[PDB]
Design a protein around this nucleic acid. Structure first.
Lengths: 50, 210, 203, 48
RNA sequence: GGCGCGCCGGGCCCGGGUCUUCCCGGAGUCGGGUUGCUUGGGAAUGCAGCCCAAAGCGGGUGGUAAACUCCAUCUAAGGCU
RNA sequence: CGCGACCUCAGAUCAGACGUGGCGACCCGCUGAAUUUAAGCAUAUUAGUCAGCGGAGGAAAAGAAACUAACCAGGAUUCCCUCAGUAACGGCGAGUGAACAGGGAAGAGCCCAGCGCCGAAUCCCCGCCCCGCGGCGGGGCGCGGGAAAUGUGGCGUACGGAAG
């Protein structure tokens, strides 16, 4: 999770999808999770401005 | 060594079958038990039917047996509630109960709301003590005349509605039987191929305009 | 109230916290004996799912199991026979390193009855399990209607005959198309139906 | 060992003049003894 | 012994239909990669080890691998009969 | 230095209750061959069978669906007839091999962990009388000990459940 939130910061969101697959499960098990991590990442890219 | 003309054939006696052989010499005074302990059953349950809690109107599935009707497991929980009988009171007066069954058509749902009134009416119900009855409990004349039932209760027989001999109109005779089976086969299979090319041909008119 | 958060935090082992706790505690089971009693249950949440209550009767032992596989027993390594059956080093056990826990609690404590088990630590040679058991003569258990299903002479040594939920899984049963080799009671009796001749009288 | 921060806040504890003062307000709001329930349950059947 | 029916003696203060507002569930497990046994199950029917190891419009199943999709049908990781 | 609470851990011919061993014809959990078939023989076959070890009962085991379907839908489990020597495997060679639908025997259906309301409302052991029992159960009386908030009992669990 920490490591996949370091390819999402720097926008390599394919390699990151292709990295989460091996760990957690199938292509749709690595989809919502890649959609969850992006949204907490996007959280702390708000709470810094405020 | 096969002689000559003569069918090839594969036996499964290569195991030690003899050590597991089953015989039915029992067969005659195994029947005469069932029938005895059968005969015990309903002397224990006196004026209650030996035919037991009543089985619903239920089909047989798939395209082979889908013309038929048979007895089932139990009445669905939207056939009991509409009629006016509860699920834990229905067990206590010969009406079947099953938590799984479905209601997908209304042609086998109206047939099972009427089934439970037929029954509710023709039942005979005894008082709690012989010396003090109440309200829904039946009179002491039926109960005199009332008695046990034999064989399935209101048994479902095979049914079909008749039809007359008819003068055919001039558009029945002008209807193809084989060429209407072949133009419904053609449009079911090819509709996937149809819709993507009415899309790809209408895709190119949008591009060359803009 | 508090048992909603105790479940969800044990489901976070790869965090910082639970990584530390499943480490200190596991050092501290390589130190004590290979079967030993435990004063109160460690995961009181997870236990209370698999049946436990707190009342003068129940009890927990905490057994440890050597980890790994099976190696086929013959002198030096010389299985005399055909080539298929030269196999000794990559074969496996059909039941589990759970149920081997439920059983060794079972044999030692022969008065008591097994009920269920659950996970608690692992190392690289050891897996550690806790293991519920019940005194079937304590008047508390004899006289709660609910419990008395266990006191009865048939439930003797459940662990030994594939009956506990950790037990059941090897015998290969469920419902449907995926489990065809059991229809009948159990694996053995599928086989038997398929191999009789059914010799009636007239034939 | 590097005790992490959430389990590390249990070494943080209330001091001496507050710990012997906080058990004197709770001294007036205790639950009743087990012997008190024999003159409270019994005290209903005297007045009624 | 077994059913039925009085006299004293013990419990037990309990039931259904319309309207509003709350509220809901089993984790090192499901799941995969690999290795060995098993099955009539064929790009693996079931079981086990070692590694990786979840989700909540979510999870299994739908007999040929997968991506992109609407439907159909069951609630798995606790228990008795 | 002492005094007291808890937690984790000794010892007893301490008070009262349990296990071992036997028989094994049928049942459950393991482990497990080679003769022999292929006119040779290594995969296959024998066969998850023989021998080995373990646990029970008057039957065992299974059991109210993470079920079959593709229908105008059946509705726990076991058992007989059928489905079939089929669909599927197989040096595609010898050879092995189901299920669902259909019709019968038998027919019965339910309980918690968890979310939270009801002053633990809950249980075990002991001293004393009245009855009483060769399945130690019935009532009264204990400033009698203990278990328990690291969670006992009551309503209650997907067919939904609760309060007003």
């Amino acid at each position: 999770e920490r490591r996949a939130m370091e390819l999402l910061k720097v926008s390599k969101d394919k390699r990151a999808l292709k990295f989460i697959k091996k760990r957690v499960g199938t292509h749709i098990r690595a989809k919502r999770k890649r959609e969850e991590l992006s949204s907490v990442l996007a959280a702390m890219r708000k709470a810094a401005a405020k | 060594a096969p002689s000559r003309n003569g069918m090839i054939l594969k036996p499964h006696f290569h195991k030690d079958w003899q050590r597991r052989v089953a015989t039915w010499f029992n067969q005659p005074a195994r029947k005469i038990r069932r029938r005895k302990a059968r005969q015990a059953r309903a002397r224990r349950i006196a004026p209650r039917p030996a035919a037991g809690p009543i089985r619903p109107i239920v089909r047989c599935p798939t395209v082979r047996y889908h013309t038929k009707v048979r007895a089932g497991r139990g009445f669905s929980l939207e056939e009991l509630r509409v009629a006016g009988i509860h699920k834990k009171v229905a067990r206590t007066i010969g009406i079947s109960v099953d938590p799984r069954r479905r209601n997908k058509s209304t042609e086998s749902l109206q047939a099972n709301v009427q089934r439970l009134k037929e029954y509710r009416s023709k039942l005979v119900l005894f008082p709690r003590k012989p010396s003090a009855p109440k309200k829904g409990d039946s009179s002491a004349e039926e109960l005199k005349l009332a008695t046990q039932l034999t064989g399935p209760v209101m048994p479902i027989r095979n049914v079909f509605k008749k039809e007359k001999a008819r003068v055919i109109t001039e558009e029945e005779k002008n209807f193809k039987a084989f060429a209407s089976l072949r133009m419904a086969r053609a449009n079911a299979r090819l509709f996937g191929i149809r819709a993507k090319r009415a899309k790809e041909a209408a895709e190119q008119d949008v591009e060359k305009k803009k | 109230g508090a048992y909603k958060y105790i479940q969800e935090l044990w489901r976070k082992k790869q965090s910082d916290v639970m990584r530390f706790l499943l480490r200190v505690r596991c050092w501290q089971y390589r130190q004590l004996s290979a079967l030993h009693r435990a004063p109160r249950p460690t995961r009181p949440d997870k236990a209370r799912r698999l049946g436990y209550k707190a009342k003068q009767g129940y009890v927990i032992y905490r057994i440890r199991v050597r980890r790994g596989g099976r190696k086929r027993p013959v002198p030096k390594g010389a299985t005399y026979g055909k080539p298929v059956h030269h196999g000794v080093n990559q074969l496996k056990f059909a039941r589990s390193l759970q149920s081997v826990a439920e059983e060794r609690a079972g044999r030692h404590c022969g008065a008591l009855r097994v009920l269920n088990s659950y996970w608690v630590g692992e190392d690289s040679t050891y897996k550690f399990f806790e293991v519920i058991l019940i005194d079937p003569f304590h008047k508390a258990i004899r006289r709660n209607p609910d419990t008395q299903w266990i006191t009865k002479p048939v439930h003797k040594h459940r662990e030994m005959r594939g009956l506990t939920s950790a037990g059941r899984k090897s015998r290969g049963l469920g419902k449907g198309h995926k489990f065809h080799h059991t229809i009948g009671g159990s694996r053995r009796a599928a086989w038997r139906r398929r191999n009789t001749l059914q010799l009636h009288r007239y034939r | 060992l590097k005790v992490p921060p959430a389990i590390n806040q249990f070494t943080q504890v209330l001091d001496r003049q507050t710990a012997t003062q906080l058990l004197k307000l709770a001294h007036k709001y205790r639950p009743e003894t087990k012997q008190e329930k024999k003159q409270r349950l019994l005290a209903r059947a005297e007045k009624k």
